[PDB]
Each structure stands twice: as structure tokens, then as C-alpha cells.
């Protein structure tokens, strides 16, 4: 997370870490939507152009973590994957359309003060909240900046990072890039005139874009960290999987297999 701050403990009890088995390394972020269901981006598991094809036993999910490195014994839970469900029309070849993936845990995880699921938006919440200029919140242990000298130069957070970024007009989003953006994506960040900065970076993908509803004071996941040409560049934006658009699919997957 670029231009971020450390999260408070429990600030994002639904954040999930995707951990690679060998090499023992961080892959991506994700979110907890149920005691046995985890939501993430499809390019975290499958992206052939960079030779990426991760399968169920290739990784594990660490839920309830605060620190990026420390093994948070007795606070975090480590769960293994029963199955991975990647969207059938996920278009990695073109624009990353439908960049979404569900993951069924083998055994249900037990909620704590540090592990709690997020809500998924209904018809109305999507309409009321996903408007240009409203701000949501993005969290992850991703890099603090695009590039940083190998000496010192920070670069990697010690703990989870959090920013609030404003939803940006679809017409502005389409003019920001030459990638064909779709109904399944929405973009967020500050415009260069706005005199403020922030964005996701490498490692934050798959994590959740959330907004707290002003009506029920609940936290809704409106976006999955999807893609961005760089990190916090001026006149560039981060693009997010528009969760409500693909929610009918999320329902089909869980009503069958869950």
C-alpha cells in the first residue's frame, strides 16, 4: 500500500493472506466472507503470461494476521484449501475481466476478535455506495512504493497497511488507460489536481476494497484489488473487481459446492 498507515489491531478482521508453500513467500491478499469461504482475485492463482498456475495444495491461507513476517501464534489461523473456483470467463488474455476467484477452506475457521467475515453488497448498497467521490478502504501487506533500493529504502511494511481512496468516474477511468475497462471493473484513487496520494502496490492484489455503510454501519466489500499500471503514478488509477456485478456467480458457486 502506497501512502498508507499501519492498521490498528482488528481494523480489518476479514483480511486474508495468501501464502506460497515453497518458496515460503507471500502471494496475495484475500477476504473472509464465511466460515469456510474466501474471496480473492483470479490473477493471484492463474496468470499464464507470467507463468503462474497455483493449485489447491500449492498454498495455504493465513487468517487473522497483523504482521507481515512474524508467525502470530494463537492469534492467526492457517487454513488449507479444499477447492479453488476461478471465474469461467476470467479474461487474463485481454483486460483481466472477471478477475475473481472463490476458495473453499477444508475445515471451517472459527471467528475471533481478529477473524470476522465481511458483508457482500446487495442491490441497494451497490447503488447507494459505489458512487464517484465516495471513499473506500484498501488493506494489504504489499510494497510501500514501486521501487526502493535494496540497501534500506523501506519498501516492505512490517504490518498490514490501510488507505482510503475515492471512487473515480468511469469516463475518467477509461481515459486513464488504453486497457479496455468493463462493467466488471471500477477504479479509485486521487486525481493529480486533488493534491493527495495513495494506491495499492505489488502484493495487495486480491485484497478487499471496503466501504462502511452510513445506514447500517456495516462494512461491505465493493472491490477486489485487481490491477494497475504501476503504483501511485500521477493521472493513473487502480482498478478493482466490481464485486456486485459478479455476485450472481459467487452465489452459484456457493449454492452448489458450499
Amino acid at each position: 500500500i502506497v501512502e498508507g498507515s499501519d492498521a490498528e489491531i482488528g481494523m480489518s478482521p476479514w483480511q486474508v493472506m495468501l501464502f506460497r508453500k515453497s518458496p515460503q513467500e507471500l502471494l496475495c491478499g484475500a477476504s473472509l466472507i464465511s466460515d469456510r469461504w474466501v474471496l480473492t482475485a483470479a490473477h493471484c492463482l492463474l496468470y499464464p503470461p507470467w507463468d503462474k498456475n497455483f493449485t489447491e495444495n500449492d498454498l495455504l491461507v493465513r487468517i487473522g494476521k497483523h504482521s507481515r513476517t512474524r508467525y502470530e501464534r494463537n492469534i492467526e489461523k492457517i487454513s488449507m484449501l479444499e477447492k479453488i473456483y476461478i471465474h469461467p470467463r476470467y479474461n487474463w488474455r485481454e483486460n483481466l475481466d472477471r478477475d475473481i476467484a472463490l476458495m473453499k477452506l477444508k475445515k471451517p475457521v472459527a471467528f475471533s476478535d481478529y477473524i470476522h467475515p465481511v458483508c457482500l453488497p446487495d442491490r441497494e448498497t451497490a447503488a447507494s455506495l459505489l458512487q464517484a467521490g465516495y471513499k473506500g478502504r484498501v488493506t494489504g501487506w504489499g510494497n510501500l512504493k514501486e521501487t526502493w533500493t535494496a540497501n534500506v529504502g523501506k519498501g516492505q511494511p512490517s504490518v498490514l497497511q490501510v488507505v482510503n481512496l475515492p471512487i473515480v468516474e468511469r469516463p475518467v477511468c477509461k481515459d486513464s488507460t488504453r486497457i479496455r475497462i468493463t462493467d466488471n471493473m471500477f477504479c479509485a484513487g486521487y486525481k493529480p489536481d486533488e493534491g493527495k496520494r495513495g494506491d495499492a502496490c505489488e502484493g495487495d492484489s486480491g485484497g478487499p476494497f471496503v466501504m462502511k455503510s452510513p445506514f447500517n454501519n456495516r462494512w461491505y466489500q465493493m472491490g477486489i484489488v485487481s490491477w494497475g499500471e504501476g503504483c501511485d503514478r500521477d493521472g493513473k488509477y487502480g482498478f478493482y473487481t466490481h464485486v456486485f456485478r459478479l455476485k450472481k456467480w459467487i452465489q452459484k458457486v456457493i449454492d452448489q459446492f458450499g
Binding site: 482488528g10 478482521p13 470476522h116 458483508c119 471513499k135 490501510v162 462502511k212 456495516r218
Partner: peptide
Amino acid sequence: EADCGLRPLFEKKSLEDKTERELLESYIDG
């Protein structure tokens, strides 16, 4: 499950993380 989106350590404890006010102010103005 029905308790989704209500964090054990803030909402349930009537507590506010250091930044959720920016989110609320964006709904009205500044």
C-alpha cells in the same frame, strides 16, 4: 455470518478506527 461487517474490536465495542471518519465525510462533504 449475519454479524458480517461488524468488527469485534470496534463496532461491537462501540469504537472507531482512526480513519473511518474520512469514509463518512466523503458521503456528505469534506
